[PDB]
RNA sequence: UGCGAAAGCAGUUGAAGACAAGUGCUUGUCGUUCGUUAUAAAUGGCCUCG
């Protein structure tokens, strides 16, 4: 798991969390998301256009 | 005359009327009237007697690429 | 069916209610009966294409 | 046999009105309609005469005990199905939907009659039986 | 069915395309290397383009477009051109010759040529028996 | 893999996106699903097919 | 059936087995037709008893 | 310009790509700038087989500019889209669509093309590779698309709901790009 | 007179029979319109028909050349 | 297309202009008009997260 803020918009902050699966999690932690905010603001990413068979998993 | 699709007769005492894939030819090689195309593809073509014309003709699994049809 | 209907006639008349204790008969014979139009047109064609190559 | 298919194909040839006529005449047997249609009508103007005699005639009576116009009809239809809808006059479309519409009706006759007919079957039995 | 395009130098991988359904059993290209066409089991002709100025710039090739022109595999693609030739040429277990335009494959017309030519004969009849 | 088991009793948010796989599919809806009419048509007549 | 006698009929003159599966169809078919009528028979007489 | 036929901006909205009748001709030109001016018979672009073929073949139904204006997509009555260089006229088919493709759409970086049609399907293509991503099963045809965002965070459609034939029965679909959900409906 | 649209007349008839009862009919006159109803069941049938009808290479060939 | 029930009952599918092809003539088309209630066919099929 890591931060990432976005170099432009520093008002952006994130967190991409990856395991042993065929699908990644990002966490937006901008604006309020991270303490206020009752609850998580959480995308899956599990697409890869066409090249599913070079990845197995996004553990890395 | 008989080609690979094609069968002609010429009669050489009349004369006849006055009225891209290939190489452009740019370069030298080197350094009474009857047409008809029903008849094809030809192995060989003769005459067996005078009135009696012999016309020979030709008479594995592919890959399936489906045609759609609605 | 066809003989109950026939031998037990009078009986079956003097009866107060038919429809209510013979209602699945009624159903099941209104389905039969609802094949015979179409069946007769699937006929027609089959017999129009039978005559066809036996005659051929 | 021969000779009524000869009148009957001059009388094609002539535009008679008695087409109708031969087209009863109680020689016919239906293997030699087969033989007449398959053999005899090879233009379409022919076709066409016959057709509007007979679906005129059955038009008009489709209850007519006479099996032998419904047998032309029906070999007719069976046997030269193929150029009769080439046929591209209106009045033979139009004498088409008259004939359809008169045999339409029979159609939606014939489940009445079955339940009368099956009806009067016991009632016969029945009889029978109080008799026996 | 896979066409991959290869970086000499360090012996690395630049493109990859599934194209085919089957096996690639032949590949050429043109004089300048603006085309590569590959055909193969699935009975397809695939038109991999670099002419863009572009493509060149970034020497990128781009899966520009197919035919299907055999009812069989295509065993055998060879090409050749010239100030007043431009030949595709293939043929396979149709056991037939098929003619394209390198430059206009999408959309140039085509020649199949007859399976069998007699030019030398392998028949004869006799009119006496 | 000694905490597989948590289940998160503990934390602030417990976030579930997980679905169940749908029921498997015959042949015949297989191939319907992916517009394979002429095969489709086959799976219906096949031994041991019910009625 | 309708379509593929409508769609193969050419196919059927020249395939001997086809013309079988189709002449044992047209005794079953009046077969059915048999039944059918018997059934709006029963259906008729039925009526009356009521 | 006189008898346009079919209309096309940029999605920066600085090129504007235009059909008229005087059979047909396309024009690119620039804007706010005198950069990009250029024009030719739709002739050139169309295959011969689709001379040969109907009129559905040579019947555009869409059209989409690049933000550069290295690349304008048609989209045919057929279904095939063709992707035209418009440094040198060389054509590209992406062929998916069974029916008249109505919406095409370029990415910002051009890397991508939106596509949507009959199918109620929108489809992605991938034009590295020549790939494409689906998100099928949407409610009705799509009649636009868009990559809406800075990033391309998010992809705005427009849906037709065709059953309705008595009345037009519009719907605007906002997607998360990143896991293609309804963003706003 | 009906053993001497129609539907309406018979479906009419129908009703008669279910009216008049088992009992009533007579054999004699229900024999003439049995052969009646079967009469008209049989042309009924056969228009049916009719209706319906209105809805619906060789190795070695000798031919003669046209020159 | 009108009416009607769903069955059906009546009634239509014309004229001009332009373009293309073939040989002034023939055929076919129309992101052209006026008037009347008035086959298809560019190899082209629907995602991933067990």
């Known amino acids: ?60 | 005359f008989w080609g690979a699709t094609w069968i002609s007769r010429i009669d050489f005492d009349v004369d006849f009327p006055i009225n891209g894939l290939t190489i452009t030819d740019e370069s030298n090689f080197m350094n009474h009237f009857f047409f008809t195309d029903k008849y094809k593809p030809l192995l060989f073509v003769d005459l067996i007697s005078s009135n009696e014309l012999a016309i020979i003709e030709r008479n594995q699994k592919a890959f399936i690429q489906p045609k759609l049809v609605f | 069916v066809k003989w109950c209907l026939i031998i037990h006639g009078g009986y079956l008349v003097s009866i107060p209610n038919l429809m209510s204790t013979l209602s699945s008969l009624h159903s099941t014979l209104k389905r039969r009966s609802d094949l015979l139009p179409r069946l007769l047109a699937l006929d027609a064609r089959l017999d129009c294409t039978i005559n066809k190559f036996k005659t051929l | 046999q021969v000779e009524i298919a000869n009148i009957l194909s001059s009388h094609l040839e002539a535009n008679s009105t008695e087409i109708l006529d031969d087209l009863m005449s109680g020689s016919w047997t239906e293997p030699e309609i087969k033989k007449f249609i398959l053999t005899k009508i090879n233009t379409v103007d022919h076709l066409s005469k016959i057709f509007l005699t007979i679906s005129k005639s059955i038009t008009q009576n489709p209850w007519n005990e006479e099996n032998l116009l419904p047998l032309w009809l029906k070999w007719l239809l069976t046997l030269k199905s193929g150029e009769l809808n080439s046929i591209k006059d209106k009045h033979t479309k139009k004498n088409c939907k008259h004939l359809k519409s008169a045999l339409r009706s029979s159609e939606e006759i014939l489940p009445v009659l079955l339940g009368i007919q099956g009806r009067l079957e016991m009632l016969r039995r029945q009889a029978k039986l109080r008799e026996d | 069915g896979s066409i991959k395009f290869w970086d000499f130098q360090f012996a690395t991988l630049n493109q990859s395309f599934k194209a085919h359904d089957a096996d690639v059993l032949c590949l050429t290209t043109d004089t300048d290397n603006n085309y590569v066409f590959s055909a193969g089991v699935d009975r397809k002709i695939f038109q991999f383009s670099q002419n863009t100025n572009k493509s060149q710039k970034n020497n990128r090739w781009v899966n520009s477009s197919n035919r299907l022109l055999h009812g069989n595999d295509i065993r055998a693609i060879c090409a050749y051109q010239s100030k007043g030739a431009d030949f595709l040429v293939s043929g396979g277990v149709e056991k037939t010759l098929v003619i394209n335009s390198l430059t206009s494959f999408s959309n140039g017309n085509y020649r199949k040529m007859p399976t069998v030519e007699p030019y030398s004969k392998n028949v004869l009849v006799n009119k006496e028996q | 893999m000694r905490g597989s088991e948590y289940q998160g009793d503990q934390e602030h948010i417990i976030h579930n996106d997980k679905v169940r796989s749908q029921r498997r599919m015959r042949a015949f809806e297989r191939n319907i699903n992916q517009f394979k009419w002429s095969e489709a048509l086959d799976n219906a007549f096949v031994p041991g097919m019910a009625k | 059936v309708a379509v593929v006698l409508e769609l193969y009929g050419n196919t059927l003159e020249s395939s001997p087995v086809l013309q079988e599966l189709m002449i044992d169809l047209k005794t079953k078919v009046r077969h059915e037709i048999h039944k059918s009528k018997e059934a709006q028979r029963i259906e008729g007489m039925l009526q009356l008893l009521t | 310009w006189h008898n346009v036929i079919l209309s096309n901006i940029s999605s920066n909205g600085k090129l504007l790509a235009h059909m008229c009748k005087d059979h047909k001709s396309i024009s690119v030109v620039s804007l706010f700038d005198d950069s990009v001016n250029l024009s030719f018979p739709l002739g050139s672009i169309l295959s011969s087989q689709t001379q040969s073929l109907s009129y559905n073949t040579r019947y555009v139904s869409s059209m989409a500019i690049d933000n550069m204006g290295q690349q304008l997509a048609v989209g045919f009555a057929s279904g095939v889209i063709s992707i035209v260089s418009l440094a040198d006229l060389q054509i590209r088919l992406l062929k998916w669509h069974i029916d008249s493709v109505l919406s095409l759409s370029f990415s910002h970086d051009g890397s991508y093309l939106l596509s949507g049609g009959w199918e109620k399907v929108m489809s992605l293509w991938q034009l590295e590779t020549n790939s494409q991503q689906f998100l099928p099963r949407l409610n009705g045809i799509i009649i636009d698309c868009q990559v809406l965002g800075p990033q391309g965070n998010y992809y705005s459609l427009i849906l037709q709901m065709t059953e309705n034939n008595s009345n037009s029965d519009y719907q605007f679909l906002l997607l998360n790009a990143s896991d293609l959900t309804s963003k706003l409906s | 007179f009906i053993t001497s649209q129609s539907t309406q007349l018979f479906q009419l008839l129908s009703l008669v029979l279910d009216s008049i009862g088992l009992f009533s009919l007579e054999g004699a006159l229900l024999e003439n319109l049995t052969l009646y109803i079967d009469k008209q069941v049989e042309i009924a049938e056969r228009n049916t028909e009719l209706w319906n009808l209105i809805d619906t290479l060789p190795t070695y060939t000798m031919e003669y050349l046209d020159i």
């Open chain 1, 1 to 60: 798991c890591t931060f990432y803020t976005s170099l432009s918009n520093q008002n952006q902050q994130n967190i991409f969390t990856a395991g042993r699966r065929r699908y990644m999690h990002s966490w937006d932690l901008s604006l309020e998301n991270l303490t206020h905010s009752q609850t998580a603001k959480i995308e899956k990413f599990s697409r890869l256009y066409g090249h599913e068979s070079t990845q197995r998993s996004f553990e890395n």
